[PDB]
Swiss-Prot record, chain B:
Changing L7F: In strain: Omicron/BA.1. This is Spike protein S2'. The chain holds residues 975 to 1022 of 1273 of the full protein. Subunit of the fusion protein that is processed upon entry into the host cell. Mediates fusion of the virion and cellular membranes by functioning as a class I viral fusion protein. Contains a viral fusion peptide that is unmasked after S2 cleavage. This cleavage can occur at the cell membrane by host TMPRSS2 or during endocytosis by host CSTL. In either case, this triggers an extensive and irreversible conformational change that leads to fusion of the viral envelope with the cellular cytoplasmic membrane, releasing viral genomic RNA into the host cell cytoplasm.
Length: 48, 48
């Protein structure tokens, strides 16, 4: 579980290319699973 | 047709798709070749 920008969601895929895909969370070309995403924006609201 | 040209160019997922096609083609071609060799081998063997 982690948080990314909404546009970024395309990255979380097997053997995918992208910054997060290369630098932070990479799924294997073999992978089996499902990915779910939603805007925690209300939650992610701080003054800062 | 140049395998490296695929590998150099494409993201891994697409590369595998293109490569799989190329392999399928070459494999089919190699199998056709081997089949040709085998059938010819029969003709040659009959001759032998």
């Amino acid at each position: 579980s982690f948080v990314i920008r909404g546009d970024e969601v395309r990255q979380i895929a097997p053997g995918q290319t992208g910054k997060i895909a290369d630098y932070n969370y990479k799924l294997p070309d073999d992978f089996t699973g499902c990915v779910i995403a939603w805007n925690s924006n209300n939650l992610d609201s701080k003054v800062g | 047709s140049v395998l490296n040209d695929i590998l150099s160019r494409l993201d891994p997922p697409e590369a595998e798709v293109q490569i799989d096609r190329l392999i399928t083609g070459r494999l089919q071609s190699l199998q056709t070749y081997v089949t040709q060799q085998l059938i010819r081998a029969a003709e040659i063997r009959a001759s032998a």
